[PDB]
Amino acid sequence: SVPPGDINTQPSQKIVFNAPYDDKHTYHIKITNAGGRRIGWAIKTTNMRRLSVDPPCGVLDPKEKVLMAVSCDTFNAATEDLNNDRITIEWTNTPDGAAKQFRREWFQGDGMVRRKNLPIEYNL
Amino acid sequence: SVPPGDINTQPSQKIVFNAPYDDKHTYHIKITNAGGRRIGWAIKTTNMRRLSVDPPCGVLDPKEKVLMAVSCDTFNAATEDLNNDRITIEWTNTPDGAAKQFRREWFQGDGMVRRKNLPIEYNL
Amino acid sequence: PPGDINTQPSQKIVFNAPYDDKHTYHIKITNAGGRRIGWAIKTTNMRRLSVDPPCGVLDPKEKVLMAVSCDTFNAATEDLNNDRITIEWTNTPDGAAKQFRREWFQGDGMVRRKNLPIEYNL
Amino acid sequence: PPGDINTQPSQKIVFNAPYDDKHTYHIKITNAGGRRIGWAIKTTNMRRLSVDPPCGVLDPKEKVLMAVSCDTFNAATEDLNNDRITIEWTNTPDGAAKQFRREWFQGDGMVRRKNLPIEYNL
């Protein structure tokens, strides 16, 4: 068993959404596999309604990178919670002999999952 | 960052439930922290209805052990699925300065979660 | 010849670790016969294993539930491939009463036996 | 003196990496005034930043949406603490038409200015 290696994202520590919030704002993230072995990854957000990602999961060989899309729906800042949203990237090494298709089971099995959060900062 | 150390369970690879299945059968598991640092752990089962565990989560200092309880509800083998149930133990190192109380957030943060499954074998 | 009998578990009994506690398992015996029978249990480790009851009588289609019991023991060191439980049965004799008697065993009668081996899961 | 104007974002504009793609952000300007105004935008990096429109006129309570744009650039190497966007506004003159004219700027009139600095998130 090996701990999945590291990944590099951009922005590296967080992500900022800028007002106005009456339009569907679609930013972008870059993920790169900074490890020695293939890995599969999947994303989770704090708001299924408000947040969206595409693609939502996948597989990267070492040093491979992917450009994914984060969106925002219209909303009303004046009354909701904005100090608490986030985007989590969970990953793990893919199994010997696996195909370039993501399989959730890879996370259920016996092993280790690595996690990275990128908080959402709302700039009004 | 450190990968959470290993844990030792007993039985070490699986768990067998023996017929007859018309009574609530309560087996037991032993978990031991075979690492160098405190860890928190929590359990998950394939059947919320049929399976049950107690206690469901906690914290073990190194070399500490816990005896937990797995149950089974009455049921009818002749028609259900028995080749697929399991019990997963997920764990991680607790954070510097944490208290002996389990906090789910420890799994959400930036880091690494370790997983161990103990399949359920039904003996008819 | 005595008729078939049913056991739940049907082929084996599985004991799970840990073994530092004494564990009581339970079995189900059912007389799938047409005639009344007497039955007794025999174990391969009188020191480790234990039964209650160890014999009884069962009107056909009648059930019994027996409690096997396992003592604490060091599993590293001992033989775990040789345990077993044996059940013997035989038709009860014309006009017998609700009382098991060994003696039905010694005779010209047919004795039937079912072997339930013990499996230790470490 | 020209009246207050509202900007969304209200204090700053945040640009997120990566920077290998050209990114268009957008701003909201609202004339919270009682009188009609003219306004123009000034940037701190004519090479990097870009606006459209760069000036216009706004009847009071009227809104405009402008598109800032960011070119590709190497973020390791350059100054990211000095960018900014400046907006200047001033009341439009008695009887003016739907057409911005720089010249309203040179005068005895009051010019107002709002500074929106740029923040680069790496």
From Swiss-Prot, chains A, B:
Record InterPro entries: Ig-like_fold, MSP_dom, Nematode_MSP, PapD-like_sf
Subcellular location: Cell projection, Pseudopodium; Cytoplasm, Cytoskeleton
Domain MSP stretches: 6-123
Keywords annotated in UniProt: Acetylation, Cell projection, Cytoplasm, Cytoskeleton
GO cellular component: cytoplasm; cytoskeleton; pseudopodium
UniProt tissue specificity: Sperm.
Pfam families in alphabetical order: Motile_Sperm
Complexes and interactors: Forms filaments 10 nm wide, with a characteristic substructure repeating axially at 9 nm.
UniProt function note: Central component in molecular interactions underlying sperm crawling. Forms an extensive filament system that extends from sperm villipoda, along the leading edge of the pseudopod.
The protein's name: Major sperm protein isoform alpha
Organism: Ascaris suum (Pig roundworm)
From Swiss-Prot, chains C, D:
Record keyword Lyase present: no
Subcellular location: Cell projection, Pseudopodium; Cytoplasm, Cytoskeleton
Physiological role: Central component in molecular interactions underlying sperm crawling. Forms an extensive filament system that extends from sperm villipoda, along the leading edge of the pseudopod.
Domain of life from the UniProt record: Eukaryota
InterPro entries found in the cross-reference section: Ig-like_fold, MSP_dom, Nematode_MSP, PapD-like_sf
Keyword annotations of the record: Acetylation, Cell projection, Cytoplasm, Cytoskeleton
MSP domain: residues covered: 4-121
Subunit structure as annotated in this protein's UniProt entry: Forms filaments 10 nm wide, with a characteristic substructure repeating axially at 9 nm.
Organism for this UniProt entry: Ascaris suum
Assigned GO CC terms: cytoplasm; cytoskeleton; pseudopodium
Tissue: Sperm.
Annotated SUPFAM superfamilies: PapD-like (SSF49354)
Any Pfam family hit: Motile_Sperm
Protein name: Major sperm protein isoform alpha
Xref: PROSITE patterns: MSP
